[PDB]
Amino acid sequence: QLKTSIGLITCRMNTQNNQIETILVQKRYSLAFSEFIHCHYSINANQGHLIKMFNNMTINERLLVKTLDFDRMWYHIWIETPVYELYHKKYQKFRKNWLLPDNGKKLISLINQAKGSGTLLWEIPKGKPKEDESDLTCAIREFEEETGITREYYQILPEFKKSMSYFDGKTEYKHIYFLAMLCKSLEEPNMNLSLQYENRIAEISKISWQNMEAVRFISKRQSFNLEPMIGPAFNFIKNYLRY
Amino acid sequence: QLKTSIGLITCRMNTQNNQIETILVQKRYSLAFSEFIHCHYSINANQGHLIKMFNNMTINERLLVKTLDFDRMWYHIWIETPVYELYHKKYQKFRKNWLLPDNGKKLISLINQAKGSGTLLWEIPKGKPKEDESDLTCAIREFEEETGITREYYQILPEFKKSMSYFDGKTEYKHIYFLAMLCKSLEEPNMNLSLQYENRIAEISKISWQNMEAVRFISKRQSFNLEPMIGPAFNFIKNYLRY
């Protein structure tokens, strides 16, 4: 099939240096954890995944799994949003895998034997377009759903549009990116994260300005490499700022 | 008074580059969170702290506080180690601050109004010496309590010893550091973190080799600056490796 996400690259010049920075966001939890409490694994096939899943969670996440209070695990991703059917499907699939048969003991054992720890991803804010939206409207909406940064702080630069496509697993994920330049100054965007706006924090743990060296530094340390999108983003910024 | 911690700086040469790296560890939770469930704050004095404490927690931590299940907050730091008296002291101090008076509503409100998010520290493994120990014995013991890295992997370099002293708050914290060079190769130290060794994970979320640029990068982004200890550590390594 074709999974397609659309995001926005928002940049500024932090006047202290002659350096272009962009907004990246960090995820609160790992994919591995999310795959676990949504049961994206089988207990009859693919052992090697079951082992990788547990290893690629953070230590805190594993500690949550060691609890066996699936509700506590659910809260970590959902934070009390009401999905009962979703909940109870996953809960019963959870109950039949390690509570009925072995009473946790295989799960708990697998948790203990799990070695190392995962890494929470830095990403360009991106999302899935609503049915009646233009690409750019999705990008705008998703960008400030995720950062509180409203329209009056940036100007869309219309003639930029980059598109990565992935199939490392497999199907095809198309990632499309517009570009924005900041105008009203905004020195501390990580300050828009607050538990009262439960959708900025549903998935984000940090918002932050990142120059290029930060972009490269983070990319050496996570599977998702994001120089191919910030590289051209910043180049386009430079050529724009000249004129 | 004189608070004194003693740690060990363990280095290697990752042959791929001509680059010296050292072991740093990351904390699982923030000081702000730990100050909160141990009641290192007053509700009658120092409002400005109460606000900073909440802001300097991670989003997950705040979500734990938004639970009001103090036991769930306790588990985050203690992971079921038996301290009942400690627990019940802190629980009752917790109960009388926001459960009795306002039934959470001021605490929950303060949580919601909390803006931004904290950062979990990267540190050189360090600890507090037992009563009958030499400095170096504390450093050795604490180093592999915290990383699983036993004695046969490194050689102590005896003629290095660095000592920082802090009083930004205030009292005096003396931080003393020995130096070790790796010998048996150890390509992936983050693999020693596992919930079966509950004391390596009690406080650590990642172990990792860091070259100098990583050291500087992390230091621009956390209050604890650690170039003054790795700087001389690496210099001493270089001069050692020559001869």
Side-chain angles (χ1 to χ4, degrees), chain A residues 1-79 81-114 116-169 171-183 185-186 188-243:
Chain A
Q1 220 127 70
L2 180 90
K3 294 318 195 141
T4 167
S5 308
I6 289 108
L8 181 62
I9 305 177
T10 293
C11 305
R12 58 113 106 131
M13 170 81 105
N14 85 160
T15 66
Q16 288 73 101
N17 323 222
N18 275 312
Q19 268 215 325
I20 302 149
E21 313 175 330
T22 182
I23 288 266
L24 305 166
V25 300
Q26 195 169 20
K27 312 303 263 190
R28 279 190 35 230
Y29 56 82
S30 54
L31 183 120
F33 183 81
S34 163
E35 262 162 26
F36 181 82
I37 69 137
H38 286 143
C39 207
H40 292 18
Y41 61 91
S42 191
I43 270 166
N44 306 308
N46 319 306
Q47 271 297 126
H49 175 241
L50 207 47
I51 313 296
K52 289 190 241 245
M53 189 169 37
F54 291 105
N55 287 342
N56 289 326
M57 313 162 87
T58 70
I59 298 291
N60 289 334
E61 271 145 20
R62 290 194 213 144
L63 290 169
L64 271 191
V65 173
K66 197 183 233 228
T67 279
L68 291 203
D69 183 314
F70 175 95
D71 204 319
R72 267 297 161 193
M73 320 190 156
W74 190 265
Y75 177 67
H76 195 51
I77 288 159
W78 295 98
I79 310 182
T81 57
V83 285
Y84 183 75
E85 301 161 47
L86 183 35
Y87 175 89
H88 187 247
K89 295 202 187 95
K90 305 311 182 181
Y91 170 74
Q92 218 78 65
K93 249 152 168 162
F94 172 29
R95 183 260 242 123
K96 297 218 286 280
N97 294 309
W98 313 266
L99 292 61
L100 165 125
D102 213 335
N103 273 323
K105 311 195 134 293
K106 224 291 167 191
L107 177 54
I108 283 184
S109 170
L110 273 164
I111 283 299
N112 292 334
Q113 331 117 258
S117 68
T119 303
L120 307 168
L121 284 207
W122 282 94
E123 302 189 312
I124 302 147
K126 91 208 94 185
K128 270 204 74 64
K130 312 299 85 156
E131 238 173 353
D132 82 323
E133 270 179 323
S134 80
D135 288 342
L136 181 61
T137 294
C138 170
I140 287 187
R141 169 195 64 82
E142 190 80 38
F143 174 71
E144 66 216 56
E145 292 201 342
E146 261 181 57
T147 76
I149 288 151
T150 63
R151 193 52 181 71
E152 90 257 41
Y153 282 81
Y154 57 95
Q155 181 217 343
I156 293 304
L157 275 45
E159 288 310 308
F160 181 104
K161 198 168 173 168
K162 181 142 237 290
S163 148
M164 333 282 311
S165 280
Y166 309 81
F167 345 74
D168 215 34
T171 343
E172 171 175 351
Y173 306 113
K174 159 181 273 283
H175 286 170
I176 301 180
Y177 295 102
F178 299 99
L179 181 56
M181 169 70 93
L182 204 78
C183 42
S185 100
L186 195 180
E188 275 144 358
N190 168 61
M191 261 335 100
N192 295 299
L193 259 186
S194 163
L195 297 214
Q196 62 177 11
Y197 319 121
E198 200 178 88
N199 56 320
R200 298 168 215 181
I201 65 131
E203 284 212 280
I204 298 87
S205 64
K206 216 168 257 298
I207 311 139
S208 154
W209 286 112
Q210 315 278 6
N211 39 65
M212 191 89 236
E213 186 223 325
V215 163
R216 289 203 235 248
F217 181 89
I218 287 164
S219 295
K220 291 184 212 122
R221 300 170 172 75
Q222 61 174 46
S223 62
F224 191 46
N225 171 23
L226 39 65
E227 168 171 329
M229 292 120 280
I230 309 311
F234 281 8
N235 195 311
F236 188 109
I237 292 296
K238 300 156 166 200
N239 271 332
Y240 166 76
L241 273 174
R242 305 262 191 259
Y243 314 80

